[PDB]
Each structure stands twice: as structure tokens, then as C-alpha cells.
Ligand binder design. Structure first.
Ligand SMILES: Cc1cc(N2CC[C@@](CO)(C3CC3)C2=O)cc(C(=O)NCc2cc(F)cc(-c3cnn(C)c3)c2)n1
Ligand SMILES: Cc1cc(N2CC[C@@](CO)(C3CC3)C2=O)cc(C(=O)NCc2cc(F)cc(-c3cnn(C)c3)c2)n1
Ligand code: PRO
Ligand code: PRO
Ligand SMILES: [Cl-]
Ligand SMILES: [Cl-]
Ligand SMILES: [Cl-]
Ligand SMILES: [Cl-]
Ligand SMILES: [Cl-]
Ligand SMILES: [Cl-]
Lengths: 481, 487
């Protein structure tokens, strides 16, 4: 099979082709739900192992809360409602969790009585259902998805904010160190922040081949807002009752999606080594051999070296298929490294190592196969990240006025604009960009993506690019998913 | 807090007290749904790690399939529908909107996965297909629930394979069965009986169902611990999962299915828990050791603090998780009880008298046996203790299992065995019609249901005399079968 749509030219078709033909995703007769085949679920398992290791160092503990919330306890136009079991009607409808704030925070008071019960730090690896009737995009925007949601309660605001930003850096490492994707850290505007949050912090990603931003992960400071709604109070060290200061943070399998859209090429899936089940595929070339079993033994001992070094590989000894067919088979599926061994290189005690990301063929003696493999795996990651980073940073153009924006938006860029952050302007900007875009399947609108944590200098009397009023801060704007 | 009910005299109240006060579960606003607090979810995490690494050796791969299924796919089922229909949860409203196309929450994932299996299996070159899911399922039963054991929503793994013939599939069925035995014995220290299920108790649509059964001798109740089904070609015919074999002729795949749930946690709790509360196998306790200081007005409290922090660092540099209970507001005895309630396998006490000797007291949660260890060896003895505790928990458990089986030849022996909280081993003709007769008559003579059901036909069969009759019908007995009250 082959990718018959160029990514730069027909992005959404390239994407569906890649995710189905690499065996990541299978479509399902309920739209917005997709089957995660082994190759994608493996990526999820990897980032889950990493994130678990890292949040246990923050003393977060894993737990599992129910899938169902009662109607009253959810007081939304996006929720699947259960009503019957078999043919009998439920006494009252129950909702499938779209998020678990109201499921968890209504039992938090049974656990929190005094300052000696804090901080409470829980995490869930679960599934949520968000039944939006807009159009789905696999991984990026789906009605059922896997995620992790963490929730903490602290005795004050300093501890809670510190954790919000510790989690945000763990999300940075999740994307950069495992998915080789660079992200922009920022604060969400108050029109786009989480409902009930004090502030929402965020990591944003950008798909430059189609000009779209994607929110990669979120860490919210809820403050005492949910504490006052659910009366989560505690006796402090002065016998005074106080409200807990709360955080919640989440990340979903959308991350896999962002990864595919960043590194994928026209040959197919390109996988960062850390998240590929097979890091190496060994492909024999049997033509012109003198001892087929010698080629077998040679490949199998390369295999033994690698997995004795904890490097998982597959030996593709299928006899019917040409070497070229197998090269394409494993390239499509994103295996980062291929080892070719033909009769000349058994004669030389060498083998050819091929990097998936640049297709550079390299002749290495077998004596240093492992070392070279390990080095290349590391370098593959570096290069995937670096290529992505420059692509990200060449996608942001600073503008001082709205008149420069549409042009920048039509070259598939993000605008860094000085903004007064007044909430009424978010919708005005969205509709104006929406109407101007209506002149050549997803939305033309431009929205605040985030106020970046790393700020350029604000010149003295800088006017807001939309309002003409004093500009509060620099904000990223762009089309998104 | 403490356990005020004795396991042997009020089992159900003992159980609810233990699971709540050890901070294992929390009760939820919706009946039959429970919160798994960190201590129980940790056990789930451990057995999941172990099972993942074992099934990956069998070349099973993890996957994730949707939570929902249309009626179209769920009714391709011939007898699967008979088995699961009244407990299926139905989603009818979406936001603020009822749409005709109502969808069901998975009670099990056969009809979800097998509906796409034909797309992935075309040739013998595609076989075997081996998939596993860690997920949640919903079985909304009208009967009243039991935390861990019978819940309306529960966590599990479900594994599903397809093979080119019967030999491969049956071999995998029993390899998975032994992985389940290892789950229970090596991690939960719970002995199980391997067996084959009766025809009336086997999974709907399965050719045969193999099973591990556990028994709670303190209330005479059997609990099905895990199952491994050989589905043969039943689901393959009904879902048209065919493949071209080596001669280019269509065949049906031979399928297996196997599952195990958070029920195992409950089984563990019911096996080892005692009147002091939870008793955890060390493999599934987050903390292996709790250090409690003992303060007497003879020595500096800071010297004891330093000593315990030394011990804690010794243990944590050896990858043994511990906790030093430094809390100044509570007595040592309070801490003893606090941590015995929560099932920590080992407690280390240091006071003045073992600080003077560079030693400490090591106490085992399973038998309260105390040891006096010099500091320089704490580590290794702790290590050995952790192993021995596990084996003790297993061995004790096994013998209460072996003493709980009464072998009978006549129904006249049955009630006296059931009312003495045993399961019976009885010669049985295995005709499906007799299962309901037995259930009803044992319910009617008992004072949770009093019925005894067929549990398993054990793989280990005692010899069967040539003219032995079925204990219930008088017809020639075929095999020995375990009967008991259950959950
Ligand atoms: C996979 C995924 C991840 C996240 N989220 C949430 C934010 C964040 C950022 O980190 C997070 C951790 C919590 C991200 O991961 C949100 C959705 C989602 O909203 N689903 C419902 C749905 C279904 C549908 F068919 C279509 C649309 C839809 C809406 N507009 N358009 C053009 C299409 C929406 N889905
Ligand atoms: C945790 C769990 C595990 C398993 N399963 C099934 C077998 C096995 C072990 O082989 C497995 C698949 C792998 C086990 O784990 C089945 C249930 C369950 O049937 N839930 C519904 C329910 C809810 C309710 F409130 C009450 C009752 C009910 C029915 N009778 N009584 C007296 C009470 C049932 N629950
Ligand atoms: O949906 C969200 O953004 C928050 C964060 C994780 C849990 N709920
Ligand atoms: O419920 C059961 O018993 C089978 C085995 C796992 C999937 N379905
Ligand atoms: Cl892993
Ligand atoms: Cl705490
Ligand atoms: Cl292969
Ligand atoms: Cl195929
Ligand atoms: Cl403590
Ligand atoms: Cl037996």
C-alpha cells in the first residue's frame, strides 16, 4: 500500500491515508469513535509509563472514579445520557463523564478535614465522552477519547500554582522528549479558559503544513471556585476553616495525532524511536546467497544483540515478498531504523543501516551494530525535534495591526499580536476573520491560542492591534482544530 | 478507627468495614459503583504490569476499542444476546437531544471487535491475531451489588485471539489459564482451582469455558476468579471471519476469549483479611515497611528520629518503598493500628532499647511475629521477610481451600456439607436440566442466595468407579464436579 496524497498539497486526505494504512487507526460504524490498533495504543502506553513515573515523584497517586454522574450532580450540551438497562427505564438518567470534576470533588469533603489531609493529589487514566455534533478528526477531535486527568487540593494558592506549572513542564517533556514535538507554553485568554478556572495554562502546537494550532495539554488553576461550589473546606493550623486551592490538568490521545501531523511524510508514518514498538526491522536479501540459513543465522544474531540490549526489533523473513516491498511496508509503518543484510555484507561482516527520517544508507561493521544503532536512535530523535522546532518558529509572524493578519493567516502562519485581552474582542475577532476567510471544511476563524509565558518586550504606548487601546500583552492567534 | 465485626461471625459487615476503613474503596452516589482509592488501584496497577509482560511474551498486543456498540452489531449474536441483553446500558440522549439511533455501552467487546476482524483477516498470513484491552465495562444488573465482587461498572482486561485451527486456540486457552493462576498465586497469594464450566454455566457462544475458582472458607462462598473461553468458530460463522488457507480454500478462524476483573482484589481481601483489617501480599502494597518510633522519657526523641531516617534511607536506596510515621500527635499504639488496618506487610519499631544496641524490631502483619534485627542487616532480613510473608499467606490460604472440599456420593450428604460452609465434590451426569433442579432444591433447604450451583468440573479428576451414579438423577455419572454457594 502507498500514500497517494501529498501532505503539503492535500493535508486531510494525506492524514486519513497515513493513519489507516500505517495500521494506527481503524474506522468504526459510530462516527467520532475510532479503534486504537496496537501501533497507536503502544504510543499511549509509552507516554503513560513516562507520565506515571514523573507524577509519582510529585506524590500524585492513581485512582479510578466512576464512569457515571447523576443529573443533579452535573449542575453539558455535549454529554451522552444513559436511560435504560435492557428494556427497563432508569429511575433517573445518568451521564457518562465528559470530565470528572463533579464526580471527584463531591467526595473530596469526605477525605479533607484539616490541613493534615493536604495536599490531596489524584490522577485517573480513563476514557471520557464528549458528544459534540461538529465534525470529528481522528485523534485530534473525537467523541470518545483516552486521557489522564489529575486533580489536586492544596492548603493555599502558592502550592497549587507551583504544581500547575510543574505539570505543565511534564507536558512539555511528554511532547518534546517522547513525541519529538515542540510546544509553546502560555496562558489562555479568559474567553477560552476552562469553565470555572481561575486561570488555564496550556501547551500549544502548530501544524504548519495546514496552518492550524492544536491545544496539546492543559493545566488549570481552579483556586477556590470549585471549593466553594462543592464546599471543600478544611481546618487550618489556626482552627479557621478555609477553602482548598485546587488544580486539574489533562492530556489525551490527541497527542498521538499531533505527533503524526508533525513528523509524517509522503512515505507515511514517521515515529520517534521512544514510542515505536519496533525500533529496528531486519530485512534479509536472499538473492545470490550460498547458504540461506547463514543469512538467517546472521540476521537472528543481530536480533539477539539488539534485544539483549533491550532494543526491540522484528526480523522480517517473509519469503514471498521482495526486499523493496518490505522496505516500503516498514517505512509506511514508521519503523525508525532498518538493517539490510545481503550476501555481500555477510561476506564482509557488515550490514546497511537506514534511518527512516532521512533515508541515509550507512555501511556499518557488525562488531559495532548495537552502538551505532543506539547512537542513530538518539540522533533520529534530535533531528525530528529540530526540524519541527524551526518549522514552529518560522510559523509565527509578529504584527502590530489587524491589516497584516489575513495575509499571515493565508500563508498558514500564526500571528503574535499586541492585545488588550478584553473578552468582548475575542468573538469580534473570530467573526471578522471568519467572514474575510469566506472567499476561497474547517473554520476560517482565528482565536487567541495563548498568551505565551515567554514574552517579547511591550513597547511603551503600544496599541492593541484590534482595539487601538493600550495593549496588555502579546498573544498568539491562529486558525485551529 | 478499627474493625468492630469479626470476619467469622458477621462476614458482610466485616468486609464493608475493612474495605472502607483501610481506604480501599469509597462509596458513590450511584449504587453498585465504587471509587477505587489509590490503595486498591495500586493492586490493579501491579497485576496489570505483571499480566502485560506475560501476555506480551505470547505476542498479544494491547489495543483500545470504542465504548459504544450499535444494536446492529450486538444482535449478530445468537446466544450472546440471551446472555447479556437485560444488563446492557443504553445511551438515548446526546446533549439535550434524543436521537432514534440508540447505542449500547459495552458489557463485553466480542461484537465490537469481531465486527472489524474480517477487515484484518483475509489470509493464513494474517494469523494468529492476538489483541488485549484494559478497559471498563458496564453490566447494569438489578440484583444488589457487592464491592469488587459484583459491580455494575468494573475494570478488567479482555483478550481476544483468532487462529487457523483448534489446536493453537485450545493451547492458548490453557496458557492464559496458567497466567491467571500465576496472577492469583504469585501476586495475590490466592490459591485457585482450574476447571471446565458446565454447559449451563459456560459463556454464551463459547464452545467451552475454562475457569479459575476461588473459595472463601469464612463464609462458604465460591467466587469465579477468571475465565478463558474457546469460542471455536461460533463467532466466526456469525461474523463471517474467514481466511484463505495455504490451499486457497476459505476457513473460519478459531477464536479464544479471556478476561479477568477487579473482582480479584476482592478475592484477595476476603482470603487474607483478618479481624485487624487488611492483609496485603507485599507485591501489591505500595508501602512494604512502615517505621514507627517508640518514645520513652529516657532518650532524646531526635536520636530516635535520626535512627529511623537512617533505616528509611537504607530501605529506599534498595528500591523498597517505606514510610516513616513521624506524626507527633499520635501514640505508637495508634500508629500500629493505623498501619495494620491498611495492610502494610512489615512494621519496624525503634525505641530506646534497640537504639542502644543498633537494632530494631521487625513485626510481620500476617502473624504478628516479632524479630530483633541489628541495623546492618535490617535490609536483607526485610527482603527475606517480604518473601516469607507471601508464601505464608499462600500456604495458609491453600490449606483452608483443601479443607473446604467435601467429596460426596449422594445428595443426602450435600446440605450438611453446605451448612458447614464447604463446597462438595460430587459425581455428576452433567445434563443441563439438572442444574436448575439442584439450584432450586438447595435454595429451598437453606436458611445472598442459598443455592449451590456447578462451579467447575476440575481438570484434576479423581478416579470414577465404573457404576457410580449421578448424585442427583441416579443416571451414570460422567465426571466429578465442584458444587457450592457463590457470589
Ligand atoms: C480527542 C479530543 C481531545 C480534546 N481536548 C480537550 C482540550 C484538551 C487540550 O489539552 C484537553 C486535555 C483536556 C484536548 O486534549 C477534546 C476533544 C473534543 O472536544 N471532543 C468532542 C468533539 C467531537 C467531535 F466529533 C467534534 C468536535 C469538534 C469541535 N470543534 N470542531 C471543529 C470539531 C469535538 N477531543
Ligand atoms: C466485578 C464483576 C465481575 C464479573 N465477572 C464475571 C466472571 C468473571 C470471572 O470469570 C469474568 C469476566 C472475567 C468475573 O470477573 C461480573 C460482575 C457482574 O456480574 N456485575 C453485574 C452485577 C451487578 C450487581 F449490582 C449485582 C450482580 C449480581 C448477580 N448475582 N448477584 C447475587 C449479584 C451483578 N462484576
Ligand atoms: O478538561 C479539562 O481541561 C480538565 C483538565 C483535566 C480534567 N478536566
Ligand atoms: O466476559 C467474558 O467472560 C469474555 C472473556 C473476556 C471478554 N468476554
Ligand atoms: Cl512500556
Ligand atoms: Cl497527605
Ligand atoms: Cl513478520
Ligand atoms: Cl489484510
Ligand atoms: Cl505519614
Ligand atoms: Cl480438586
Amino acid at each position: 500500500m502507498a500514500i497517494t496524497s501529498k501532505k503539503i498539497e492535500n493535508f486531510s486526505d494525506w492524514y486519513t491515508q497515513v493513519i489507516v494504512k500505517s495500521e494506527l487507526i481503524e474506522y468504526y460504524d459510530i462516527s467520532g469513535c475510532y479503534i486504537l490498533r496496537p501501533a497507536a495504543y503502544y504510543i499511549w502506553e509509552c507516554v503513560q509509563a513516562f507520565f506515571n513515573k514523573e507524577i509519582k515523584k510529585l506524590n500524585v497517586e492513581n485512582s479510578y472514579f466512576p464512569l457515571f454522574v447523576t443529573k443533579n450532580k452535573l449542575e453539558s450540551p455535549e454529554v451522552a445520557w444513559v436511560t435504560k438497562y435492557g428494556d427497563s427505564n432508569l429511575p433517573e438518567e445518568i451521564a457518562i463523564r465528559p470530565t470528572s470534576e463533579t464526580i471527584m470533588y463531591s467526595v473530596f469533603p469526605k477525605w479533607i478535614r484539616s490541613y493534615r489531609d493536604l495536599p490531596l493529589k489524584l490522577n485517573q487514566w480513563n476514557t471520557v465522552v464528549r458528544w459534540e455534533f461538529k465534525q470529528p478528526t481522528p485523534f485530534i477531535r473525537t467523541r470518545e477519547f483516552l486521557w489522564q486527568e489529575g486533580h489536586t487540593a492544596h492548603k493555599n494558592e502558592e502550592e497549587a500554582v507551583k504544581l500547575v506549572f510543574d505539570i505543565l513542564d511534564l507536558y512539555r517533556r511528554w511532547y518534546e522528549e517522547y513525541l519529538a514535538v515542540p510546544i509553546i507554553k502560555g496562558i489562555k485568554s479568559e474567553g477560552e479558559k476552562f469553565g470555572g478556572a481561575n486561570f488555564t495554562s496550556t501547551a500549544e502546537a502548530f501544524i504548519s503544513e495546514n496552518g492550524r494550532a492544536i491545544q496539546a495539554a492543559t493545566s488549570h488553576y481552579l483556586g477556590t471556585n470549585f471549593a466553594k461550589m462543592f464546599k471543600i473546606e478544611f481546618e487550618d493550623e489556626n482552627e479557621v476553616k478555609q477553602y482548598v486551592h485546587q488544580t486539574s490538568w489533562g492530556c489525551t490521545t490527541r497527542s498521538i495525532g499531533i505527533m503524526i501531523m508533525t513528523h509524517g511524510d509522503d512515505k507515511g508514518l514517521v515515529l520517534p524511536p521512544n514510542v515505536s514498538k519496533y525500533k529496528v526491522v531486519i530485512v534479509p536479501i536472499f538473492y545470490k546467497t550460498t547458504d540461506e540459513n547463514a543469512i538467517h543465522s546472521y540476521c537472528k544474531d543481530i536480533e539477539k544483540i539488539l534485544k539483549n540490549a533491550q532494543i526491540n526489533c522484528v526480523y522480517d523473513d517473509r519469503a514471498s515478498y521482495s526486499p523493496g516491498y518490505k522496505f516500503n511496508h516498514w517505512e509506511l509503518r514508521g519503523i525508525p531504523i532498518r538493517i539490510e543484510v545481503g550476501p555481500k555484507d555477510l561476506q564482509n561482516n557488515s550490514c546497511v543501516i537506514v534511518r527512516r527520517d532521512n533515508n541515509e544508507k550507512c555501511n556499518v561493521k557488525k562488531e559495532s551494530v548495537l552502538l551505532e544503532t543506539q547512537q542513530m536512535l538518539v540522533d533520529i530523535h534530535k533531528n525530528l525535534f529540530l526540524k519541527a522546532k524551526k518549522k514552529l518558529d518560522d510559523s509565527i509572524v509578529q504584527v502590530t495591526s489587524f491589516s497584516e493578519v489575513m495575509n499571515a493567516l493565508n500563508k498558514k502562519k500564526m500571528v503574535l499580536a499586541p492585545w488588550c485581552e478584553d473578552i468582548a474582542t475575542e468573538e469580534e475577532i473570530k467573526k471578522e476573520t471568519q467572514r474575510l476567510s469566506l472567499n476561497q471544511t474547517l473554520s476560517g476563524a482565528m482565536k487567541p491560542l495563548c498568551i505565551p509565558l515567554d514574552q517579547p518586550p511591550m513597547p511603551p504606548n503600544m496599541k492593541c492591534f484590534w482595539s487601538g487601546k493600550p495593549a496588555k500583552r502579546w498573544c498568539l492567534f491562529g486558525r485551529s482544530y
